[PDB]
Each structure stands twice: as C-alpha cells, then as structure tokens.
C-alpha cells in the first residue's frame, strides 16, 4: 500500500556531489515508474535491458536510487561503456547495466550568480573506478615523482575540483540532477512492485 518515497529522491532540497554520489535503498513499497516517465520533466530517461513503461509490471527485492549533480554535457558519461572524468573517476556503470538513467536541468536550483562552488568532481585518481565504486578520499594526488607529504605544491594536486555552476548561455555547462535506478533480485520475496 505505501507508495515508494520517490519524492524524497527526485525532489530532495540538496543533491550530492558526483564524487560523493548518494545511494538510497527503496524497499517494501509500491512503485509507479510510469508516472515518472509519462511526464515532461526529464531530458534523459534512458532504460537499459527494459522499456520504461514495462517497469510497472515487475517486482524486485530492492531498488537503489543513486543521485548526484554533473554538467549537462557529462550526462552522456552516465551510461554503460563510457569514458571520461566522470565515468572514470566519479561514477561508473557496469557494461551489463540493467536499469534507468534519469536527468533534468537543475540550473534554477544549483547554479549561483557568482558560481556554486559546493559541487565537486574528482579530477585525479590512480586508477579507474570499478562499477558502482565510490571514492570520497581527499588525499593529495601525486602527479609526479616527488611524494607530496600530504600538502599541495609542485605536481601535488588536491584531487577534487569545483564546478562553480553559474547561469551560463549553454545548457551543456549547467548543472543537471541525475537519478540512476537499479533493480535487485535476491533469493527472497519481492518487496517493490508496480501498481497491481
């Protein structure tokens, strides 16, 4: 009977930085995905392995909603098999992803006239993330052969960089809020079904 708390995910006042992407477990509730899809709200609503209007027919043990903010021209990296700073170092989907990627322009919420420096992304990392891996460390990144002794300096960079989101002409540079839905089946009774 209880509707799934999608409002808390999509309409959260604050969204996470992509390097510190949030995960919310959805369980024991009724999910209406078609109400989300049958709207003018989302500039990306891409599902992998399933059509969006078929989700209401299925039942899962849990649903996970991962959410964060990136640039509009980075939304393309939130897909299987992509590369670039976001896919490589911030949020990585597996090659065999089944699930949905939902995005919408959040300029009015997340940009500031002088720039919103609270949203960050990881620019440097010793290796690429594995799928669904998360890295929130802030150790100084050693880009050369001199060790950094935990202090930024020559070839020693703080690994996170700010987006500084501003209300620009091109929407590609504006912030977009992203929700990634993934659907989990365990050897256990389902707890998240569509309407009857």
């Amino acid at each position, epitope marked *: 009977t209880n509707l799934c708390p999608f409002g808390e995910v999509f309409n959260a006042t604050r969204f996470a930085s992509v390097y510190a992407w949030n995960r919310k477990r959805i369980s024991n509730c009724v999910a209406d995905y078609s109400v989300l899809y049958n*709207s*003018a*709200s*989302f*500039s*990306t*609503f891409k599902c992998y392995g399933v*059509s969006p209007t078929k989700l209401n027919d299925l039942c899962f043990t849990n649903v996970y909603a991962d959410s964060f903010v990136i640039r*509009g021209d980075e939304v393309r990296q939130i897909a299987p098999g992509q590369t670039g700073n976001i896919a490589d170092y911030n949020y990585k989907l597996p090659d065999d992803f089944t699930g949905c990627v939902i995005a919408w322009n959040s300029n009015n919420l997340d940009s500031k006239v002088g720039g919103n420096y609270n949203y960050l992304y990881r620019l440097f990392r010793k290796s690429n993330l594995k799928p669904f891996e998360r890295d929130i460390s802030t150790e100084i990144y050693q880009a050369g052969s001199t060790p950094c002794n935990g202090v930024k300096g020559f070839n020693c960079y703080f690994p996170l960089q700010s987006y500084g989101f501003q209300p620009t002409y091109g*929407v590609g540079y504006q912030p977009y809020r992203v929700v990634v839905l993934s659907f989990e089946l365990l050897h256990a009774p389902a707890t998240v079904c569509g309407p009857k």
Partner: nanobody
C-alpha cells in the same frame, strides 16, 4: 541508439516549400524524441524544432514559428519537417537528432541529444 538519415533537401526559390525526412534505422522510434537543427558555415547549430516521444509536445524556435511543422510516423520510423514560406535566411545544413527523454519532453538544446544524422543542404 538509432542511426538517422536526413532526406529532402535541395534548392528552392524564396517563398517555396520543402519537406525534410529523418529516417531512423536500428531501434524503433517509440522511445525517441527527434529534434531538427540547422547550421550555417562557420556557425553553431541552432535548434529549430522538436517532437517528444509521445508526439504530444512539439516546440518551435521563434525564427520558424508558424512556417515549420514537425511530425512523427512511428510505423515508418520517420520524422518530418514541413518548411513553408522559405526565406534565404533559412539556408543551412539541416540535421535531425535523437534522444530518449521522458514521454512528453523535447528541447532545442544540442547537448541534450545523443544521435545525429549527417545533414542535408537547404538552399533558398
């Protein structure tokens, strides 16, 4: 993802008409929005018209409002752009592009589209 191919471009006298076609191969168009963009030499692509996956929302740039009409045929997996009252300002390479947004969404923003055609030349 689809592959898109534009057709129907060519030379036209000022005041005439053209009907561009955007044929999709691979996927069906059921889940795709389609947008029409144009690009003059050395310039940036200007969104001109779009249609949502549902076909319920069509948006037009102010420069073409009233003279251009976009439409979709899911059975043929083709989207059309009817161009009436063509002025020499409308001369450009015309591209169609595809995206998978929510059912009633479509924009004129190039960065919100994934799949692009090669374009066809319209000369007024």
């Amino acid at each position: 993802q689809v592959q898109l191919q534009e057709s129907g471009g060519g030379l036209v006298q000022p005041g005439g008409s053209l009907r561009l076609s955007c044929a999709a191969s691979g996927d069906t168009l059921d889940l795709y929005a389609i947008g029409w963009f144009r690009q003059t030499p050395g310039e940036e692509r200007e969104g001109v018209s779009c249609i949502s996956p549902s076909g319920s929302r069509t948006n037009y740039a102010d420069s073409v409002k009233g003279r251009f009409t976009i439409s979709r045929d899911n059975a043929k997996n083709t989207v059309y752009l009817q161009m009436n009252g063509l002025r020499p300002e409308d001369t450009a390479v015309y591209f169609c592009a595809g995206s998978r947004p929510s059912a009633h969404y479509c924009s004129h923003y190039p960065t919100e589209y994934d799949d692009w055609g090669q374009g066809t030349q319209v000369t007024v």
